[PDB]
Amino acid sequence: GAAKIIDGKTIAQQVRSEVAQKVQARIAAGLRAPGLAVVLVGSNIYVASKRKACEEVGFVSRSYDLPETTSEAELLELIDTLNADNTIDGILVQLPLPAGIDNVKVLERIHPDKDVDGFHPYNVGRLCQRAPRLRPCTPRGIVTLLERYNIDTFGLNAVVIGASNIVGRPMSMELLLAGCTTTVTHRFTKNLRHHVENADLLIVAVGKPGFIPGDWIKEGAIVIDVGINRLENGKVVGDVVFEDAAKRASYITPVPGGVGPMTVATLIENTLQACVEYHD
Amino acid sequence: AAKIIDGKTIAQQVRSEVAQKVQARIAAGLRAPGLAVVLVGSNYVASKRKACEEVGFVSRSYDLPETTSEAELLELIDTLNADNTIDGILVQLPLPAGIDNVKVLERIHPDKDVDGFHPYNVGRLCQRAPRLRPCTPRGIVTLLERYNIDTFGLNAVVIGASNIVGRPMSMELLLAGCTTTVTHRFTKNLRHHVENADLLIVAVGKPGFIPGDWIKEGAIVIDVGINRLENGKVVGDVVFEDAAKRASYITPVPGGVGPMTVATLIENTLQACVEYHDPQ
Ligand SMILES: CO[C@H](CC(=O)O)[C@@H](C)C(=O)[C@H](C)/C=C(\C)[C@H]1OC(=O)[C@H](O)[C@H](O)/C=C/[C@H](C)CCC[C@@H]1C
Ligand SMILES: CO[C@H](CC(=O)O)[C@@H](C)C(=O)[C@H](C)/C=C(\C)[C@H]1OC(=O)[C@H](O)[C@H](O)/C=C/[C@H](C)CCC[C@@H]1C
Numbered sequence: 001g002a003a004k005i006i007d008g009k010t011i012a013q014q015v016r017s018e019v020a021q022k023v024q025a026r027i028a029a030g031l032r033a034p035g036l037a038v039v040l041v042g043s044n045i046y047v048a049s050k051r052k053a054c055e056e057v058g059f060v061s062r063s064y065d066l067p068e069t070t071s072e073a074e075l076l077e078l079i080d081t082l083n084a085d086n087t088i089d090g091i092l093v094q095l096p097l098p099a100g101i102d103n104v105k106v107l108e109r110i111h112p113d114k115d116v117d118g119f120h121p122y123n124v125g126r127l128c129q130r131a132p133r134l135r136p137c138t139p140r141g142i143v144t145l146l147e148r149y150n151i152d153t154f155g156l157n158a159v160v161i162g163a164s165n166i167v168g169r170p171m172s173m174e175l176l177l178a179g180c181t182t183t184v185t186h187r188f189t190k191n192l193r194h195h196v197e198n199a200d201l202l203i204v205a206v207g208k209p210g211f212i213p214g215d216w217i218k219e220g221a222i223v224i225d226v227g228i229n230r231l232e233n234g235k236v237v238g239d240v241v242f243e244d245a246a247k248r249a250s251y252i253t254p255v256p257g258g259v260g261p262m263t264v265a266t267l268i269e270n271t272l273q274a275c276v277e278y279h280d
Numbered sequence: 281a282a283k284i285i286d287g288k289t290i291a292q293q294v295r296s297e298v299a300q301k302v303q304a305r306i307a308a309g310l311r312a313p314g315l316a317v318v319l320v321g322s323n324y325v326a327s328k329r330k331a332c333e334e335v336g337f338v339s340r341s342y343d344l345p346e347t348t349s350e351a352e353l354l355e356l357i358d359t360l361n362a363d364n365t366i367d368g369i370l371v372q373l374p375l376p377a378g379i380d381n382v383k384v385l386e387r388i389h390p391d392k393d394v395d396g397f398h399p400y401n402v403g404r405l406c407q408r409a410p411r412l413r414p415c416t417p418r419g420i421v422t423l424l425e426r427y428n429i430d431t432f433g434l435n436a437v438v439i440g441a442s443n444i445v446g447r448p449m450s451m452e453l454l455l456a457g458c459t460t461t462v463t464h465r466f467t468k469n470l471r472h473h474v475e476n477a478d479l480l481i482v483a484v485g486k487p488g489f490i491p492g493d494w495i496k497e498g499a500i501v502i503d504v505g506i507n508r509l510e511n512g513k514v515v516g517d518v519v520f521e522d523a524a525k526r527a528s529y530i531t532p533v534p535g536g537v538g539p540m541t542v543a544t545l546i547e548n549t550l551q552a553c554v555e556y557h558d559p560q
Contacts, residue, residue: 104409124406125399128451129443131382155466163454165407172450173406176441176462181473183461184454188433195459198472 003249006224008141011148012261016057019272023058034275036061036090036116037082041075041097042068053264059271062088072101079109089275090116090267113278116270119165128173133278134270136170141262142203142224143174144269149251151201151222154179159199161185161192161212161239167205167226175201204239214244223252226259282527285502287419290426291539298543298550299335306336310560313553314338315368315394316360320353320375321346328370331542337549338365350379357387367553368394368545391556394548397444405451411556412548414448419540420481420502421452422547427529429479429500432457437477439463439470439490439517445483445504453479470494482517492522501530504537 023033036059038047047063054061064078075097082091091114097103112122118136126133146153158180162168172182183195196202196216204212205226217223227239238255246252253259302312315332317325319342332339342356353375360369369392375381390400396414404411424431436458440446446462453460463473474480474494482490483504495501495518505517516533524530531537554560 119407121403121407121409122400123403125401125403128402128406128447129397129399131399155468157468169406169408169451169454172460172462173447176447176464179464179466181461181463181467182450183459184450185459186454186457188457189459190433190435 001219001247001249003223003246003252006145006149006222006251006253006258008145008253008258009256009261011145012141012265014148015144015262015265016053016268019268020057022272022276027058031280032087034059034089034271035087036092036271037085037088038063039066039075039078039082039091039093040064041066041070041094041101044096047094050264050267053268054271057268057272059268060087068098070098070101072106075101075106076109079106083109083111083114086279088114089279090114090271092117113274116267116274118170118270124170124173127170127177130177132177134274135174135266136166137266137270138167138226138259138263139171139174140270141266142171142226142259143178144266145224145253145259145262146178146201146222151251153201156180156200156222157183157198158201158203159183159185159195160203160205161196162205162207162226164205167203171203171205175203206239208239209237210239210241212240212245214241214247217245217248219248220250221248223249224259225253225255227255228260282501282524282530285423285427285500285529285531285536287423287531287536287538287540288534290423291419291543293426294422294540294543295331295335295546298546301550301554302336310558311365312336312338313367313549314340314365315370315549316340316342316363316366318342318344318353318356318360318369318371320344320348320372320379323372323374325372328542328545331546332549335546335550337546340366346376348376348379350384353379353384354387357384361387361389361392364557366392367557368392368549370395391552394545394552396448396548402448402451405448405455408455410455412552413452413544414444415544415548416445416504416537416541417449417452418548419544420449420504420537421456422544423502423531423537423540424456424479424500429529431479434458434478434500435461435476436479436481437461437463437473438481438483439474440483440485440504442483446481449481449483453481484517486517487515488519489517490523492519492524492526495523495526497526498528499526501527502537503531503533505533506538 112120163186175182201222203224209229225238225240436453441464481502487507503516503518
C-alpha cells in the first residue's frame with residue numbers, strides 16, 4: 001500500500017495566506033493589524049521561527065525580555081497591563097519561568113480572550129462544553145487537516161495515544177466535537193495494540209521516535225503523528241514508523257511537514273480570531 | 281450474581297463524614313459552610329436543601345420574581361461572590377427567557393461553583409488539576425473508591441457524551457488511570473465497545489438502551505439513568521436483572537448514582553469552605 005500524504009506544510013501555507021488576505025483587508029479598511037505579545041523571563045528558535053510566520057501574515061509582534069530577577073508580582077502586573085492593552089490580541093508566556101514563580105498563576109492571569117495558545121482552563125472548559133472560544137493550537141490544527149482533506153469525522157473510531165494536557169486530553173474533546181468515538185490511552189493502558197488496531201483515526205502524541213510500528217495500524221486508517229523527536233544528528237522524526245505505516249494507512253502525516261506547521265498556523269488563526277471577534 | 285454498589289448507603293456515609301467535619305469546625309469556633317441558591321420564577325431544590333440542613337450547613341434561598349432583569353441577577357451573583365459566609369452558589373435553571381444563561385452562570389466565582397460546571401472548573405479537571413468537580417462524575421469516582429475498585433489500567437467505556445456526565449466523566453476516569461472510551465449517538469457498533477469494557481458507565485437517559493447480555497463478564501456497571509416509566513416506576517439505562525447475571529458489581533436504580541450526586545454537592549461545599557475560603 002501507499003498512503004496519501006497529509007501535507008501539513010502546504011495546508012499551513014494556505015491557512016497563513018488566508019489570514020494574510022484578511023489582514024490586508026483590515027488595513028485597507030483603516031483597521032489595525034492584529035497584535036501579539038511574547039513574554040520572555042530570563043534566558044534559556046521556535047519563538048524566532050514563529051515571529052517570521054507572524055511577519056508573513058502582517059501581524060505586529062512585541063517581545064518583552066525581563067531579567068531573571070523578575071518577581072512573580074512584577075510578572076503578574078505585566079500580564080495585567082497586556083490584558084488591558086487594546087492593541088494586543090494575543091499573549092504568549094514562554095516557559096520555563098524562573099524558580100519561585102508559580103507558572104499556573106501566571107498563565108491563568110492571561111485573559112482567556114488573549115490566550116491564543118488555547119490552554120487557559122476557561123478555554124479548555126469551553127471546548128469540553130461544546131462552546132469553544134480560543135482552542136488549543138495543536139488539536140485544532142489537526143481537525144483543520146482533516147477538514148481540508150475532506151475526511152468525514154462523524155462515527156470514526158478515534159484513538160489518541162498519550163493523555164498530555166498539551167495534546168492528548170484536549171484532542172479527545174476536539175474529536176468528540178467532531179463526532180468521533182474517542183479512546184484516550186496512556187501509560188496504564190494494557191494491550192495498547194488492541195486499541196490501535198481498531199482505530200479509523202490514530203493520533204499519536206507520546207514523544208518517542210518510532211514508537212508505533214506500522215504493523216499495528218488498521219488498514220485504511222488515518223494516521224496523525226504529533227511527535228517531534230530531535231535525533232542527535234539534528235534532524236526530526238515522528239512517533240510513527242512512517243515507512244511501515246504508509247503500507248497500511250489511507251492517509252498519513254509526515255514528520256517534519258505535518259502537524260508542526262499546523263500548530264504554528266493555528267496560533268496565527270487564533271490571533272486573528274481574537275482580534276476580529278473579541279477585540280474589534 | 282453481581283454485588284450491589286449501594287450508593288444510597290455510600291451517600292449517607294459521605295454526608296455523615298461532612299456532618300462530623302462541620303461538628304469539629306463548630307467545636308473549634310469556626311463558621312459552618314454556607315450555600316446560596318438563586319431561583320428566578322417557578323418550576324430537587326427541596327431535597328438538596330434538606331441535605332444541607334442534615335449536615336449543619338447554613339443555607340440561603342433567593343426567590344426572585346420573573347420580572348428580575350439580567351443586570352439585577354448579575355449584581356446578586358457579585359454580592360454572593362463577595363459574601364465571605366457563602367461558600368457555594370447555585371443558580372437554578374431555567375431562567376426567564378430574556379436572560380443570558382451563560383453570562384449569569386459564568387459570573388459565579390469558580391471557587392464557589394459547587395455544581396462544578398463553570399468552564400474554568402471543567403478545564404482544570406481536563407488539565408489534571410481539578411478544583412471543584414462536576415458532581416455526578418465525582419460521585420461515581422467516590423463509589424469506586426469506597427468499594428475498593430482499582431481503576432488503573434481498566435478499559436472504561438462511557439455511553440453518552442453529555443456535558444453534565446459523559447464528557448467530564450471521561451476526564452475523571454483518565455485521572456483515575458482508566459483507558460477511557462466515550463461513545464455517543466454516532467458510535468458505530470456499540471456492542472464491540474461494551475464487550476471490552478471492564479468499567480461501563482451508562483448515561484443516555486433511555487431505559488434498556490444497553491441490553492444486559494452485552495456486558496462483559498465481571499464488568500463494573502455504573503447506571504446513571506433515572507427514567508420514570510409509565511407504570512410509575514423509576515428505572516435506569518441498563519436492564520438490571522440481565523446485567524446482574526454478568527457484572528461483578530452493579531449500581532441499582534433508584535439508590536445508586538442519584539444519592540451520590542447530592543452528597544457530592546455537599547462535599548464540594550465543604551471543600552470550598554475548608555480549602556478555598558476559610559482555611560486553617
Ligand atoms: C513547523 O514545525 C516544525 C516541525 C515541522 O516542520 O514538522 C517545528 C520544529 C517548529 O519549528 C515550530 C515553530 C515549533 C513547534 C511546532 C513547537 O511547538 C510550539 O512552539 C508551541 O507553540 C509551544 O510553544 C511549545 C510546546 C512544547 C512544550 C515544545 C515545542 C513543541 C513543538 C516542537
Ligand atoms: C437521590 O437521587 C434520586 C434518585 C435515586 O434515589 O436513585 C433523584 C431522583 C433525586 O431525588 C435528586 C435530588 C436529583 C437528581 C440526582 C437530579 O440531578 C440533579 O439534581 C443535579 O443537581 C443537576 O441539577 C441535574 C440536572 C438534570 C439536567 C436533571 C435532573 C437529574 C437528576 C434526577
